[PDB]
Amino acid sequence: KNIESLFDYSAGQFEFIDHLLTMGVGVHFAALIFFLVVSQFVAPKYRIATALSCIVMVSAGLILNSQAVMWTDAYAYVDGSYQLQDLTFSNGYRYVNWMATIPCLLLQLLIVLNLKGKELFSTATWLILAAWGMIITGYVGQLYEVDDIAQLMIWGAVSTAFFVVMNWIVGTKIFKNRATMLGGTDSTITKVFWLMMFAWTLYPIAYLVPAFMNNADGVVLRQLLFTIADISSKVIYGLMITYIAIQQSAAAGYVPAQQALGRI
Template sequence: MDSNPYKRRNKITKATLGILAVTLLFGTQTVSAEATALATNDWVGISFWIATAMMLAFTVFFLVERQNVPDKWKTSMTVAALVTGVAWYHYTYMREVWAMGDGSPLVYRYIDWLVTVPLQVVEFYLILAAIGVGTFVMFRNLMGASIVMLVAGFFGESGAMDGTLELSSTVWWFIGMLGWGYILYELWSGDVKEAAASGSPGVQFAFKSMRIIVTFGWAIYPLGYLMGAGTIGGMGTDDMNILYNVADLVNKGAFGMMIWYAAKHDE
């Protein structure tokens, strides 16, 4: 075993840079297929491009900083990088769909959410598992509730089940809200909250900060759903996409930043 910590750190740094290089190469091949002009007054398109760039920036930051936090936080930092990295990949497609005039990239967006949102919810389990109080039941229930929330949202917005289940978009919205409501219950009153109370100051900071984001940051999504459905007067698909893009930036980026901040102050 190499006893020189500098050499070990150097090897890890090179591995991280290698991962970043492969990611950037893959991403460049993805987004360079076709250059699309963006109008100066296309605020929806601008929000897509800003979100794409910021997701990549967050991913690079989380991967690099993963080497600078205690071991018990490394998995959480890896998942934070996965969340923004997967989002960046999907945003490279979503922005092109919009810029080429093909409408709202609903399918790409929900594919992204079906990967990234459960990962975010699992972060609560990971920070608790790191201190030995996370359980499989917590993992299962949080993951299941997030999937119910997302699948209901997709069926409601896309109408994919209209020929099978005759449920209105409002009913699907309500089902999705039940999934989110269960997550909030666990974070504010359930077993997850009780388990977090035994954590270190760093764990409690991360838990409380992430809980605030899930409570208030995620409230933007049902609002966007109603905008897209035309329920809120004077607002439609354009407003929905801007709102979703801003929400993704805040909820994915800030989520990871709270974990990083807690990890740095839990050394």
């Protein structure tokens, strides 16, 4: 049902996708160790924001690892090209993983925005419901990326509606609570919003690849887009969230945070 299954791949195409996925694994688990060691410099009220980055790193790292092994399982070099064997490859499992990772990315944002109690629970709930609507409708849509391009587009339209509403909630919370943030992170959190807008929008572009580039090179392009997007939306994002957590911790008088920023 996926366009990946339609084509044979040259040695170059096959190996590049393998390297993209493998590199993705290394980047996330490398970042995992960074987030782990810096967590001790975060104040208790923000420390879960940094923990969520660890959780996202392993989750994304495992799905990338799984995709890489699925890639090598499904294809073998036969008569001059990599051809599909018995096992299959699908991006569908990425969608399932987003059901967990996207709420995590949203939650660590709400935390450094200094949301608490009732407002935190209610905002998270609406955000997660919007994200799940986006992901599920998108998942259904990509089931038709070979059989029914029209259906892919309509489901994508519905998914985009959830996407836009989700982004509106995020933007509204960011620009409203910006004033509550310490140590100059009121400026930093604004760049985080724009980072999210840019990075998350790469995913629907990858989703539409079967519509404007239905060939083996399009398959390479989609994996390349995912790689750029994953690194930007999880790793660079996580690094900025953690920076914001540490900076606000120091400004609130957390001594290990103050000492940490003092060494650098």
